[PDB]
């Protein structure tokens, strides 16, 4: 958040989950980032740069996460057709 | 009679059989004198009880394991079965037998090898 | 029955947004509902929407994000007179920095920030933020 | 996938899946477990697809790789079949096994001499190991597991469908899991057959 | 001298990164929404601005065949005026011990608050981001934004909490019983918490994402470390 002074106020900007486009708390203990490791996709070996996601605790605890992680990954690798 | 052994006996009995496994007989008198020498016992009467239970454990442990108490030679044979049980490798005769619409799945896996069939009967339950 | 068409539409989008759905089904379509959702799209609270056609009253399908929080109806439809406006705008909006009460005027349907610049009051329809 | 054939289905493994009866699946469905089933049989069996198994195996495995230190991807199983399997798993790839009764409060406590604090979990059968799953959402652990066709999905980020009512279906699936992580992280990859048997990942079973 | 100090040895992973000094703000912890379990972590980053304000020391008691048996339950607030506040309740058989038990529990539950402006910016926030609520068992508070210089207009009990939060100007409205202050204070605390969980058009820009402090500093967490 930016004032007319140009002072960039607010203690931190909180992360916004890709599960359902909404923002998690600071004591929500069911909200998990999950790092998937990319591979070269020519031999099948680790290659550097991870794809990281984040999911909110609310959709997790009702049990929607299995579809959400699949849908996110389906538009990338290592699922492209299921 | 009455009297069930207290927890002080059953707790320490387990320790004493574990670490001096190969120093026990199956006689009361020998196992008594051993407990006096390998460890302090604050009484004589207390010793005569703890010995007798140590004896009673040692009878069963030679017929296989008693839970919560693990001697060395049992954990040896545990590992020896777990690195490979004596039984053959095979999965499970290297032939697959399928049924109608298991074959249909396999078409949609884009493969087709080693065909067999067994024909199934209508219908679930009755 | 369904005496208020607009009132039945918005409750759906409210319920749906809470669960996290990003496609919905709203019926019956009315022209009034179209221009409503147009304003809600421009500002960027919802995405593009598809009008299925029948020969009855239509049905609408919407693509939405988690940006929406609450859109309400106000029944019955009161008048506003551009000094009554401020009294309204306090009550329906959580802030002075965002949210838009919507209304209809003789100059067409629009948000309140725009209506004040046309210098014309009119009849209030709903709100959102 | 997108790799040429080195991250895609192999002709060999299809035979192993079908010989171990993984394709067969229980007589019930959920509203989340109907996107991996194709259809039902003549019989009450519901037939899991193996294409759908294969993709889910991979990205599951790629997440298990992604930790820098593998010594804290804590595997858990309490049913008898998945005991022998997990022990070899956690010997092969650096992990910490928890076999048998869980003893709850493991990660919640601060004072307990069996305290653990992993990052991931890989659980067999959600509806036998419900205690660690519930406890996962108090310490922000991602979660992976093997679902039947009717196991409840809730605190399961990714599933890896399986038959898992026992038999060879259990041990085979843990073996395949351990094959993949070594191809990707290690240098075991050669795309020519691994030495280790799926035989010694199966259940001990009452012996002769 | 002749006397050392030795204070705090962490047995917790999060505690270990702080003691070895790789995490250097609370803002790192909160962004991953990590558990906190040790009350020295919070008191290391802060503890140079934390005050306590013992609200009530309330008796409760159960019944037994030998008569009464009385335990003392006290509520204790905690907060710096920079926007971190917390709250805790605890009970014990004796008084002083219960108070000191509450100051520990209160440190554990500290959270940040998000402050904003009335409608025009001039630097340094002074009020609540938006009109929010919070209910605890049919007590509720409705924090409503207010322009500068109106002070905090509330009952004495929430006037403690909001003042400790550093929120300068506010209007409030209550509903239902408020003479059972254990609910009343928790309901205030509930309301201030929700501020960062309220989505605003400001926050619609996309967050980059970054690897966990646990992940990046894992090479220091494995050598002999917990």
């Amino acid at each position: 958040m930016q004032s007319n002074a140009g002072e960039f106020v607010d203690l931190y900007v909180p992360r916004k989950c890709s599960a359902s486009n909404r923002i998690i708390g600071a004591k929500d203990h069911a909200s998990i980032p999950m790092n998937v490791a990319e591979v070269d996709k020519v031999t099948g070996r680790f290659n550097g740069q991870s794809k990281t996601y984040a999911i909110c605790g609310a959709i997790r605890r009702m049990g929607e996460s299995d579809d959400s992680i699949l849908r996110l990954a389906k538009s990338h690798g290592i699922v492209s057709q299921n | 009679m009455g009297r069930v052994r207290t927890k002080t006996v059953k707790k320490a009995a387990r320790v004493i059989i574990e670490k001096y496994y190969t120093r026990l007989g199956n006689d009361f008198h020998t196992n008594k004198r051993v407990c006096e020498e390998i460890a302090i016992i604050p009484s004589k009467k207390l010793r005569n009880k703890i010995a007798g239970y140590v004896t009673h454990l040692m009878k069963r442990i030679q017929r296989g394991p008693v839970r919560g108490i693990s001697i060395k030679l049992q954990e040896e044979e545990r590992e020896r079965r777990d690195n490979y049980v004596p039984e053959v490798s095979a999965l499970d005769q290297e032939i697959i037998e399928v049924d109608p619409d298991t074959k249909e799945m396999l078409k949609l896996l884009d493969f087709g090898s080693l065909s067999n069939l067994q024909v199934t009967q209508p219908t679930v339950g009755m | 029955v369904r005496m208020n068409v607009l009132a039945d539409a918005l409750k759906s989008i409210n319920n749906a947004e809470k669960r996290g759905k990003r496609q919905v089904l709203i019926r019956p379509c009315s022209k009034v509902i179209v221009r409503f959702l147009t304003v809600m799209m421009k500002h960027g609270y919802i995405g593009e929407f598809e009008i299925i056609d029948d020969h009855r009253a239509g049905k609408i399908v919407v693509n939405l994000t988690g940006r929406l929080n609450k859109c309400g109806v106000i029944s019955p439809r009161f008048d506003v007179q551009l000094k009554d406006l401020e009294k309204w705008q306090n009550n329906l909006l959580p802030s002075r920095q965002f949210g838009f009460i919507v209304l209809t005027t003789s100059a067409g349907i629009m948000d309140h920030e725009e209506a004040r610049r046309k210098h014309t009051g009119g009849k209030i329809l709903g709100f959102f933020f | 996938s997108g790799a040429l054939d080195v991250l895609q289905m192999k002709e060999e493994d299809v035979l192993k899946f079908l010989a171990a009866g993984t394709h067969l699946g229980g007589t019930n469905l959920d509203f989340q477990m109907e996107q991996y089933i194709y259809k039902r049989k003549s019989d009450g069996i519901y037939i899991i697809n193996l294409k759908r198994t294969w993709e889910k195996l991979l990205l599951a495995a790629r997440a298990i790789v992604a930790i820098e230190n593998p010594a804290d991807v804590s595997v858990i199983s309490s049913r008898n079949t998945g005991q022998r399997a997990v022990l070899k798993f956690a010997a092969a790839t650096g992990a910490t096994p928890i076999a048998g009764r869980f003893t709850p409060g493991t990660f919640t406590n601060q004072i307990q001499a069996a305290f653990r604090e992993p990052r991931l979990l890989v659980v067999t059968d959600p509806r036998a190991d419900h205690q660690p799953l519930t406890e996962a959402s108090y310490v922000n652990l991602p979660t992976i597991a093997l679902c039947n066709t009717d196991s409840p999905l809730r605190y399961v980020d990714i599933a890896i469908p399986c038959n898992n009512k026992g038999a060879h279906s259990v041990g085979l699936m843990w073996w395949m899991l351990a094959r993949e992580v070594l191809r990707m992280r290690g240098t075991i990859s050669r795309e020519h057959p691994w030495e280790v048997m799926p035989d010694l990942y199966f259940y001990r079973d009452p012996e002769e | 001298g002749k006397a050392g100090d030795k204070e705090w040895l962490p047995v917790t992973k999060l505690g270990r990164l702080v003691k070895d000094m790789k995490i250097k703000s609370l803002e790192e912890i909160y962004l991953f929404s990590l558990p906190i379990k040790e009350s020295e972590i919070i008191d290391f980053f802060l503890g140079a601005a934390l005050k306590d304000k013992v609200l009530k020391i309330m008796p409760v008691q159960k019944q037994t065949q030998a008569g009464q048996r009385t335990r003392f339950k006290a509520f204790v607030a905690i907060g710096d005026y920079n926007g971190h506040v917390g709250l805790g309740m605890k009970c014990s058989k004796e008084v002083a011990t219960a108070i000191r038990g509450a100051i520990i529990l209160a440190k554990l539950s500290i959270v940040p608050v998000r402050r904003g402006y009335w409608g025009n910016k001039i630097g340094k926030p002074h009020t609540v981001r938006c009109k929010v609520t919070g209910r605890c068992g049919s007590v509720l508070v409705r924090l409503i934004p207010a322009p500068r210089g109106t002070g905090i207009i509330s009952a004495p009990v929430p006037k403690k909490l909001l003042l400790m939060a550093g929120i300068d100007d506010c209007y409030t409205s209550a509903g239902g019983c408020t003479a059972t202050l254990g609910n009343f204070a928790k309901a205030t605390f509930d309301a201030i918490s929700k501020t960062y969980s309220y989505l605003t058009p400001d926050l619609w820009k996309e967050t980059v994402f970054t690897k966990s402090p646990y992940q990046e500093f894992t090479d220091h967490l494995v050598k002999t470390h917990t």
Side-chain angles (χ1 to χ4, degrees):
Chain A
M1 181 175 186
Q2 287 286 4
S3 55
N4 296 336
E7 185 179 57
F8 190 37
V9 294
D10 300 348
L11 303 176
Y12 72 114
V13 178
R15 57 184 182 183
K16 186 189 303 81
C17 298
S18 298
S20 50
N21 312 321
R22 57 196 68 222
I23 54 179
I24 50 72
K27 294 292 180 182
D28 194 358
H29 300 303
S31 300
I32 55 99
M34 185 167 66
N35 290 69
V36 186
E38 294 185 60
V39 292
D40 38 59
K41 310 178 189 65
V42 183
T43 53
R45 184 184 299 276
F46 188 92
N47 177 234
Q49 302 100 289
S50 299
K51 290 176 178 294
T52 191
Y53 287 139
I55 294 295
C56 52
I59 72 97
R60 206 159 79 100
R61 64 176 52 90
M62 57 180 65
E64 293 285 0
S65 54
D66 186 60
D67 286 61
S68 301
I69 293 294
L70 178 57
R71 290 160 64 254
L72 293 165
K74 188 172 178 61
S75 305
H76 301 86
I78 194 62
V79 182
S80 295
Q81 185 59 55
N82 186 232
Chain B
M1 282 288 107
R3 195 177 295 173
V4 169
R5 307 171 211 263
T6 51
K7 61 180 72 176
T8 59
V9 179
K10 299 193 180 300
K11 192 167 186 177
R14 292 177 181 117
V15 182
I16 298 168
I17 185 161
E18 187 178 61
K19 306 190 307 184
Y20 291 82
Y21 176 54
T22 58
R23 293 289 302 282
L24 293 173
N26 301 103
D27 176 62
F28 179 60
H29 306 295
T30 56
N31 296 357
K32 181 172 57 56
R33 290 288 180 222
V34 167
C35 296
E36 197 181 300
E37 187 257 297
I38 65 181
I40 54 174
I41 313 289
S43 300
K44 181 184 72 183
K45 190 173 182 296
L46 185 56
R47 192 182 71 256
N48 293 1
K49 283 185 170 296
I50 195 170
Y53 187 48
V54 166
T55 304
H56 184 69
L57 285 163
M58 193 64 181
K59 315 195 75 61
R60 295 169 59 200
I61 205 166
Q62 300 176 359
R63 295 171 57 256
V66 177
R67 298 194 290 179
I69 174 60
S70 296
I71 52 172
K72 305 188 296 181
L73 310 182
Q74 291 175 348
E75 294 291 294
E76 174 274 300
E77 195 177 301
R78 186 69 282 275
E79 186 184 64
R80 199 192 66 80
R81 299 292 188 172
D82 192 64
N83 54 46
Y84 188 59
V85 288
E87 296 79 68
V88 300
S89 299
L91 178 48
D92 293 299
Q93 56 180 304
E94 309 299 307
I95 310 178
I96 53 176
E97 299 78 59
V98 292
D99 296 291
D101 296 293
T102 302
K103 196 184 301 301
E104 187 59 56
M105 303 300 173
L106 232 169
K107 295 182 188 66
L108 300 170
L109 296 183
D110 310 296
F111 289 118
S113 297
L114 216 172
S115 300
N116 284 292
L117 193 57
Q118 178 66 80
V119 181
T120 56
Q121 293 184 291
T123 191
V124 195
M126 181 179 173
Chain C
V1 300
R2 180 180 294 103
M3 304 185 186
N4 275 290
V5 191
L6 183 60
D8 284 54
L10 301 178
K11 292 175 183 179
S12 305
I13 318 178
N14 194 36
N15 290 317
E17 188 283 312
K18 292 175 181 181
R19 302 303 180 282
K21 308 184 196 307
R22 56 214 70 191
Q23 281 81 13
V24 293
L25 184 65
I26 309 175
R27 59 180 180 91
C29 195
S30 303
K31 72 189 188 296
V32 189
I33 304 177
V34 174
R35 298 183 183 87
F36 191 95
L37 294 169
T38 303
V39 173
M40 192 70 76
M41 186 170 61
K42 283 185 179 300
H43 303 304
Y45 291 84
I46 58 174
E48 305 178 305
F49 53 90
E50 298 72 59
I51 303 88
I52 296 177
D53 294 73
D54 305 303
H55 288 294
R56 288 89 171 85
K59 299 182 183 182
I60 325 176
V61 172
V62 184
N63 299 123
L64 58 154
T65 51
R67 292 179 171 173
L68 189 62
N69 299 293
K70 178 65 177 294
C71 47
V73 61
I74 297 294
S75 297
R77 292 184 173 183
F78 298 113
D79 305 301
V80 182
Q81 301 179 11
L82 306 169
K83 50 181 182 297
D84 293 350
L85 179 57
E86 285 64 61
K87 305 182 182 298
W88 288 118
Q89 179 188 358
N90 182 61
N91 297 331
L92 286 313
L93 299 183
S95 298
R96 181 179 289 268
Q97 298 183 355
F98 57 92
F100 293 107
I101 68 181
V102 59
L103 59 162
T104 183
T105 61
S106 55
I109 305 178
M110 54 187 76
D111 59 286
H112 70 298
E113 301 287 354
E114 189 168 299
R116 199 187 297 189
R117 292 186 286 106
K118 296 299 178 63
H119 208 76
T120 49
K123 292 184 180 296
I124 195 170
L125 296 171
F127 62 105
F128 58 98
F129 51 83
Chain D
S1 293
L4 301 311
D5 192 62
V6 296
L7 294 173
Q8 299 194 114
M9 197 175 278
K10 300 296 191 65
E11 181 70 283
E12 310 84 66
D13 292 68
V14 179
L15 312 175
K16 306 180 194 301
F17 284 134
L18 289 168
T22 58
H23 63 298
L24 307 175
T27 62
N28 288 298
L29 298 174
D30 302 311
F31 69 111
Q32 298 288 355
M33 286 301 289
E34 53 186 359
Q35 59 180 355
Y36 298 124
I37 300 298
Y38 264 41
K39 50 182 173 294
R40 198 178 188 183
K41 203 176 179 184
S42 301
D43 302 298
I45 306 175
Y46 284 81
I47 309 177
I48 317 179
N49 200 37
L50 295 174
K51 193 61 59 179
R52 297 284 181 155
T53 305
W54 187 277
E55 284 80 74
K56 297 299 299 183
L57 193 66
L58 292 168
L59 77 172
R62 301 205 307 170
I64 295 169
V65 168
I67 195 170
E68 294 182 51
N69 173 233
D72 62 300
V73 173
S74 290
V75 299
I76 310 181
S77 189
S78 55
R79 55 189 298 191
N80 302 102
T81 55
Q83 294 181 310
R84 206 288 181 90
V86 298
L87 253 291
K88 305 307 293 295
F89 188 80
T93 305
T96 301
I98 305 179
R101 185 175 179 266
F102 180 57
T103 305
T106 308
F107 316 139
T108 324
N109 283 301
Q110 296 170 56
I111 300 176
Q112 181 182 359
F115 179 77
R116 287 294 295 110
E117 186 173 359
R119 186 175 298 184
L120 287 89
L121 294 173
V122 189
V123 178
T124 309
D125 199 294
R127 206 199 302 123
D129 293 69
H130 55 88
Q131 294 297 114
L133 296 173
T134 51
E135 186 171 295
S137 58
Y138 297 138
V139 272
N140 305 63
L141 309 174
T143 306
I144 306 178
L146 285 66
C147 297
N148 187 358
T149 52
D150 58 291
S151 298
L153 274 60
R154 170 173 292 206
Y155 306 124
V156 178
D157 292 295
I158 173 166
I160 309 176
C162 185
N163 179 57
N164 72 110
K165 285 192 174 298
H168 303 287
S169 300
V170 181
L172 187 61
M173 190 60 64
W174 283 103
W175 177 75
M176 289 193 177
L177 187 58
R179 196 181 72 158
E180 292 301 299
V181 296
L182 294 173
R183 287 180 169 195
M184 295 167 184
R185 186 180 56 75
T187 186
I188 287 70
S189 52
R190 187 176 62 160
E191 308 297 289
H192 288 301
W194 196 32
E195 307 79 59
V196 184
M197 287 286 188
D199 197 68
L200 40 60
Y201 267 67
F202 300 141
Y203 179 40
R204 183 183 178 183
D205 195 73
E207 298 180 288
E208 47 176 349
Chain E
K2 59 183 90 292
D5 192 56
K6 75 298 172 61
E7 204 67 61
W8 189 38
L9 183 64
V11 293
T12 303
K13 189 172 292 299
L14 183 57
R16 189 74 276 179
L17 288 179
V18 172
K19 187 58 180 296
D20 295 306
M21 201 65 167
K22 301 294 182 298
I23 296 176
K24 292 191 171 60
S25 54
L26 289 175
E27 310 310 298
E28 293 176 55
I29 312 177
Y30 293 140
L31 181 55
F32 290 94
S33 306
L34 303 175
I36 181 170
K37 292 180 185 176
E38 303 187 306
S39 300
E40 300 302 289
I41 302 175
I42 185 59
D43 200 67
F44 171 68
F45 297 117
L46 280 292
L50 296 173
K51 291 83 204 66
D52 292 297
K53 292 182 178 176
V54 183
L55 300 175
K56 191 173 178 180
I57 301 176
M58 180 175 174
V60 289
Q61 50 187 172
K62 62 188 298 302
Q63 184 67 277
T64 188
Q65 57 182 354
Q68 314 303 112
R69 176 179 175 193
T70 193
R71 310 177 69 191
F72 298 113
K73 183 172 72 171
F75 298 82
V76 181
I78 186 171
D80 49 69
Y81 305 110
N82 307 305
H84 292 286
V85 265
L87 179 58
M89 46 182 276
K90 177 58 179 296
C91 54
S92 300
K93 300 302 303 300
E94 305 297 299
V95 178
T97 188
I99 301 172
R100 191 182 70 255
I103 297 167
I104 298 297
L105 197 69
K107 283 172 180 178
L108 196 65
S109 301
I110 290 177
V111 286
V113 303
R114 185 184 183 197
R115 294 194 295 269
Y117 296 89
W118 191 55
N120 55 87
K121 317 299 188 300
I122 199 62
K124 306 301 187 299
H126 64 98
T127 187
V128 294
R129 188 64 187 85
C130 47
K131 182 173 69 181
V132 288
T133 191
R135 60 175 296 277
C136 180
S138 74
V139 191
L140 60 89
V141 182
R142 184 176 53 156
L143 308 176
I144 300 168
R148 298 182 176 276
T150 57
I152 307 173
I153 305 186
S154 306
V157 182
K159 192 151 60 181
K160 292 289 184 63
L161 289 168
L162 296 169
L163 181 60
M164 285 281 261
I167 301 166
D168 297 75
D169 304 295
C170 200
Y171 301 132
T172 56
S173 296
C177 189
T178 39
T180 45
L181 72 81
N183 293 297
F184 192 18
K186 291 176 64 176
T188 302
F189 192 60
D190 189 51
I192 64 177
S193 190
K194 292 180 180 176
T195 55
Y196 268 111
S197 300
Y198 198 96
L199 184 64
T200 54
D202 294 54
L203 298 175
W204 287 356
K205 60 177 183 177
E206 181 53 56
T207 303
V208 189
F209 302 111
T210 187
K211 295 179 171 63
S212 298
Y214 283 7
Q215 186 170 3
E216 296 177 59
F217 296 115
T218 194
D219 64 296
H220 193 70
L221 285 171
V222 180
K223 287 196 293 187
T224 188
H225 296 68
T226 194

